[PDB]
Design a protein around this ligand. Structure first.
Ligand SMILES: [K+]
Ligand SMILES: [K+]
Ligand SMILES: [K+]
Ligand SMILES: [K+]
Ligand SMILES: [K+]
Ligand SMILES: [K+]
Ligand SMILES: [K+]
Ligand SMILES: [K+]
Ligand SMILES: [K+]
Ligand SMILES: [K+]
Ligand SMILES: [K+]
Ligand SMILES: [K+]
Ligand SMILES: [Mg+2]
Ligand SMILES: [Mg+2]
Ligand SMILES: [Mg+2]
Ligand SMILES: [Mg+2]
Ligand SMILES: [Mg+2]
Ligand SMILES: [Mg+2]
Ligand SMILES: [Mg+2]
Ligand SMILES: [Mg+2]
Ligand SMILES: [Mg+2]
Ligand SMILES: [Mg+2]
Ligand SMILES: [Mg+2]
Ligand SMILES: [Mg+2]
Ligand SMILES: [Mg+2]
Ligand SMILES: [Mg+2]
Ligand SMILES: [Mg+2]
Ligand SMILES: [Mg+2]
Ligand SMILES: [Mg+2]
Ligand SMILES: [Mg+2]
Ligand SMILES: [Mg+2]
Ligand SMILES: [Mg+2]
Ligand SMILES: [Mg+2]
Ligand SMILES: [Mg+2]
Ligand SMILES: [Mg+2]
Lengths: 66, 177, 215, 177
RNA sequence: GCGACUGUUUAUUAAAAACACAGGACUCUGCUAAGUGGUAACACGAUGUAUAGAGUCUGACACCUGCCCGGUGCUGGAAAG
RNA sequence: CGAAACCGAUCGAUCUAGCCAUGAGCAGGUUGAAGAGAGCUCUACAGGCCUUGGAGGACCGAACCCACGUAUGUGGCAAAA
RNA sequence: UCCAUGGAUCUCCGAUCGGGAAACCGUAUCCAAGCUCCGUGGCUAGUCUGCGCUCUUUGGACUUUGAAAACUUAGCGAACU
């Protein structure tokens, strides 16, 4: 059995942030959940992560592109 | 056996029988759990409806039968809570842990699970507390800042930290003096 | 008695004679000895000190000997920012969008009154949750209550927060949190610090004793 | 009165070392190969546990490697102890305790030792050795070894499987160190 | 003759050569010790630490304690099957 | 009409077995361990004699504790004198 | 005398203010409000005001649910035969 999670930062073998990935439940429940490195793939947290990353990475893209 | 009625009597005696209209009584009858829990330690943990069972142990050749029991897979764990920002120490069955995995955490499990399914007065208390804190969070908003403001406020915090350090050391040395 | 032990280190305990808490014998062939008093011994010796061995005495509670030792050593213009780059409102985190109370009596109000105190909260005891700010953690944020009329943009240095990098706490208990919610419900010249230690071989009175700490 | 004694120790520190400070306590990481010690802590800061009886001492065999020392205990077994745990230099006092002897039955009663009845002098309702007419041990050419009052053996190197498993786990953990 | 001794024992037909005993040996226990009681928590062991704790047999003191591991137990062992 | 027994739940350590806490008791008379100290003896320690001392599951023997022998009693004074 | 209705008095345990060898012991609960009597302090001294407790009225603070034969619904669940 595996879980769906949404990355909030960049984990080396998992992937970049804003991305949903599949992990072991003992990995997510004991490591990523208390350290705020991932959130469960439910609709409220997906919306929250998407909008906050949109607002910050708008500034980041505005700085990087020009 | 009549756990709904014995919990409703305690809730009525706490809140006052004059306070409730008959329609509110009819609605409150359908939130108080009416489950079958007898064992003492299941009223102090999150068991998700698992109970003990007493049955027969049967021999292979003789068929002789003697009493035995099956116990739920109770484990003591710490579960992380998003609104309390900390761990909660519980005694959960692995069935309850798997339901928590499906729901998306202990807080989301408490929000999603209705009142009748909480099985326990402490379960009702915890669901009520989490719902009240989420309703408090439901009326707040955060405002983010531009990187120039990021730098300005970072410099201001550095100034206040170094000034507080200087003043604290000066006060300590003068009190020594 | 010829030499009574020092009264600051003498304790009194009874005899069990091999009987546990239930009163039944668990260790056999014990009981009916002589009366004893218990001596308190420093078995840690973690404090780094220097001492003089005063006397070597007799301890009935143990096979070895003990030694009495006296120890001889040991208002500025804050960056008020009016510019906000975006507003995020936590209105779907409850999971059900509903209005705000100040009237019929409801089930949630009954359950709030039944489990409330015997006689806003996002501070003091628990503070702001980290989740709100999860899409971008290293960003300075200002939480504020949502107003019906449009609010002001003036933000002082005290109203702006950032979890540094230290935080990427304590722990509640499922069955014992309701009780805690319910309100909680050198000396002078005439003195000398002395301790009892287990005496070693060839350790008589007048000698030196060292306690050493890590270097 | 006291500074003179500190000064005399300071002058004698040239002539002594850590291995000629009988009765002094220092952590095991500071000691040397071949040091005779006693009163070894197992955990740092908890208290002396290991070598405390009269006349007994342990010996250091190996230097700190990965923060652990090898110590030979009075039973002959060797153990790997954390190097931050304290010990005491020397041998525990009263080393002649094990060669003194009693001369009458009342000296055992003064220490609180009640009389002990052999199991062969009993009935079958009390001991597995009891029963029989005349002097008898109640097993023959097809019996069992000498047994405790609750049935477990006590000769020939018997120990329970829990103790076997625990000691094997400890030795296999200590071999990789 | 028997038991080394002073002791203890079948209240109410047996007080003894029986039990105990100081002394001797063997096996287990590295400390959240082994062992004992409880479903468990826990308690005794012990505010003790192998010169210590538990179990078994013999029974002061003197001189001694021979041969057998095939059997019943107990215990150690890299693999193959 | 009639068993010896089997099972469930409670009552009993005011008798008796062991233990824990706090109190009390042991007339009188003997024997003389260790230790200690004067005159002899040793190069000197050490040793012998004498004096002192008062140990002991020590001796004789009342109160106290026990019950070894015989006689009486046997619906007894007494379901154990 | 008696009857009907309404009143006044109405000890204690069980038992619940705390302790407890049931029928006993110890107990002014606590804090705001406004009223007669009381005593004391201070003013330029007249329908002058400001401080207290005791006891009284009205609220609110802590808790005291509580018994009971059979029926009902649940948990665990024998052995004789
Ligand atoms: K014996
Ligand atoms: K019996
Ligand atoms: K026998
Ligand atoms: K026999
Ligand atoms: K027999
Ligand atoms: K003999
Ligand atoms: K006799
Ligand atoms: K006997
Ligand atoms: K053999
Ligand atoms: K064999
Ligand atoms: K005497
Ligand atoms: K049957
Ligand atoms: Mg013996
Ligand atoms: Mg017999
Ligand atoms: Mg028995
Ligand atoms: Mg048997
Ligand atoms: Mg025979
Ligand atoms: Mg034979
Ligand atoms: Mg003959
Ligand atoms: Mg005899
Ligand atoms: Mg005699
Ligand atoms: Mg005798
Ligand atoms: Mg008899
Ligand atoms: Mg007789
Ligand atoms: Mg203990
Ligand atoms: Mg014998
Ligand atoms: Mg032989
Ligand atoms: Mg039967
Ligand atoms: Mg009783
Ligand atoms: Mg009693
Ligand atoms: Mg006398
Ligand atoms: Mg005598
Ligand atoms: Mg008798
Ligand atoms: Mg009362
Ligand atoms: Mg009823």
């Amino acid at each position: 059995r595996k879980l769906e999670v949404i990355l909030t930062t960049g984990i080396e073998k998992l992937g970049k942030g804003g991305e949903t990935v599949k992990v072991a439940p003992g990995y997510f429940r004991n490591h990523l959940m208390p350290k705020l490195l991932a959130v469960p793939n439910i609709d409220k947290y997906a919306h929250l992560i998407r909008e906050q990353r949109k607002m910050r990475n708008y500034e980041e893209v505005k700085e990087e592109v020009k | 056996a009549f756990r709904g009625k014995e919990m409703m009597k305690k809730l009525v005696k706490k809140v006052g029988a004059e306070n409730i209209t008959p329609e509110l009584k009819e609605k409150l009858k359908a939130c108080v759990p009416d489950t079958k829990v007898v064992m003492g330690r299941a009223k102090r943990g999150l068991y998700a409806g698992r109970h003990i069972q007493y049955g027969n142990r049967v021999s292979e050749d003789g068929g002789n039968k003697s009493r035995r029991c099956w116990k739920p897979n109770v484990q003591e764990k710490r579960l992380f809570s998003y609104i309390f920002d900390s761990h909660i120490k519980v005694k959960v069955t692995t069935h309850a842990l798997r339901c928590i995995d499906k729901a998306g955490g202990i807080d989301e499990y408490l929000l999603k699970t209705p009142y009748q399914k909480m099985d326990t007065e402490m379960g009702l208390y915890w669901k009520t507390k989490v719902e009240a804190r989420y309703a408090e969070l439901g009326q707040m908003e955060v405002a983010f800042f531009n990187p120039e403001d990021e730098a300005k406020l970072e410099q201001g915090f550095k100034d206040l930290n170094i000034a507080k350090k200087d003043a604290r050391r000066e006060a300590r040395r003068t009190f020594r003096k | 008695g010829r030499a009574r032990a020092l009264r600051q280190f003498t304790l009194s305990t009874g005899k069990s004679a091999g009987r546990n808490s239930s009163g039944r014998i668990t260790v056999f062939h014990r009981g009916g000895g002589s009366k004893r008093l218990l001596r308190r011994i420093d078995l840690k010796r973690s404090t780094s000190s220097m001492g003089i061995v005063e006397s070597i005495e007799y301890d009935p509670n143990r096979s070895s000997q003990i030694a009495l030792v006296r120890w001889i050593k040991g208002k500025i213009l804050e960056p008020t920012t009016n510019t906000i780059s975006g507003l995020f409102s936590f209105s779907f985190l409850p999971g059900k969008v509903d209005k705000r109370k100040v009237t019929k009596t409801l089930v949630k109000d009954v359950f709030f009154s039944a489990f409330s105190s015997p006689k806003l909260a996002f501070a003091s005891s628990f503070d702001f949750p980290r989740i709100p700010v999860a899409g971008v953690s290293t960003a300075f944020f200002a939480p504020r209550m949502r107003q019906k009329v449009r609010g002001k943009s003036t933000f002082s240095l005290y109203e702006v927060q950032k979890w540094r990098t230290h935080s990427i706490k304590a722990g509640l208990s499922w069955q014992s949190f309701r009780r805690q919610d319910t309100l909680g419900l050198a000396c002078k010249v005439d003195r000398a610090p002395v301790t009892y230690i287990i005496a070693s071989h060839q350790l008589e009175a007048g000698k030196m004793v060292m306690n050493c700490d890590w270097s | 009165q006291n500074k003179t004694l500190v000064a005399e120790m300071e002058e004698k520190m040239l002539h002594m070392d850590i291995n000629s400070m009988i009765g002094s306590s220092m952590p095991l990481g500071m000691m040397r190969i071949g040091t005779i010690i006693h009163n070894i802590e197992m955990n740092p800061g908890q208290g002396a546990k290991l070598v405390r009886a009269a006349g007994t001492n342990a010996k250091i065999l190996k230097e700190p490697a990965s923060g652990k020392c090898l110590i030979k205990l009075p039973s002959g077994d060797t153990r790997w102890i954390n190097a931050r745990c304290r010990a005491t230099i020397g041998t525990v006092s009263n080393p002649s305790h094990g060669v003194k002897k009693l001369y009458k039955a009342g000296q055992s009663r003064w220490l609180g030792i009640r009389p002990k009845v052999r199991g062969v002098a009993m009935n079958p309702c009390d001991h597995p050795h009891g029963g029989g007419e005349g002097k008898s041990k109640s097993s023959g050419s097809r019996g069992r070894t000498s047994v405790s009052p609750w049935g477990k053996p006590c000769k020939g190197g018997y120990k329970s499987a829990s103790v076997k498993k625990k000691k094997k786990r400890l030795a296999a953990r200590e071999a990789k160190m």
